[PDB]
Design a protein around this ligand. Structure first.
Ligand code: A1EHO
Ligand code: A1EHO
Length: 147
């Protein structure tokens, strides 16, 4: 029936069925469509006070809470999905990762190199698809699979 990773869910505010992926935290209205040695991803990282290194090019001392970081991530996802903003533009401006200078691009990678909730979400995304909030010891990520 459903591809692995996906489940049916019910909207609380409309009652309409939707689909949720518990590996990528993606959610969508349509029934999902459905592994390679390597994938290529970009990401937008929002750090918080419990990040492994709570500092970034944006801020010497990152002091926001994980709850505040998630609210920021959720707001960026809204703007990307509505088309008000582009993923690459938000990553260049607001990602707490050094990859901000490359529009969030991390290049290609294999299994065994990234933190593993990042890796699992990356390889579960289809080409062009974007994750929901993904949690690692670095912070909270939005992941875009580009290849
Ligand atoms: N976007 C979110 O914060 C989220 C949620 F509200 C429920 C499940 C998974 C999620 F990533
Ligand atoms: N792909 C990357 O990891 C990267 C880059 F291409 C340029 C600057 C910083 C980075 F982390």
């Amino acid at each position: 029936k459903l591809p692995p990773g996906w489940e049916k869910a019910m909207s609380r505010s409309s009652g309409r069925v939707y689909y949720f992926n518990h590996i990528t935290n993606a959610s969508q209205w349509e029934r999902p469509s459905g592994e390679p040695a390597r994938v290529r991803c970009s990401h937008l990282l929002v750090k918080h006070s419990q990040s492994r290194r709570p500092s970034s090019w944006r801020q010497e001392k990152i002091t926001r809470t994980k709850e505040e970081a998630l609210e920021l991530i959720n707001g960026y996802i809204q703007k990307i999905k509505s088309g008000e903003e582009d993923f690459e533009s938000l990553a260049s401006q607001f990602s707490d990762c050094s990859s901000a200078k490359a529009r969030g691009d991390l290049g290609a990678f294999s299994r065994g190199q990234m933190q593993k909730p990042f890796e699992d979400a990356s390889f579960a995304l289809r080409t062009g698809e974007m994750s929901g909030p993904v949690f690692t010891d670095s912070g909270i990520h939005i992941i875009l699979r580009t290849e």
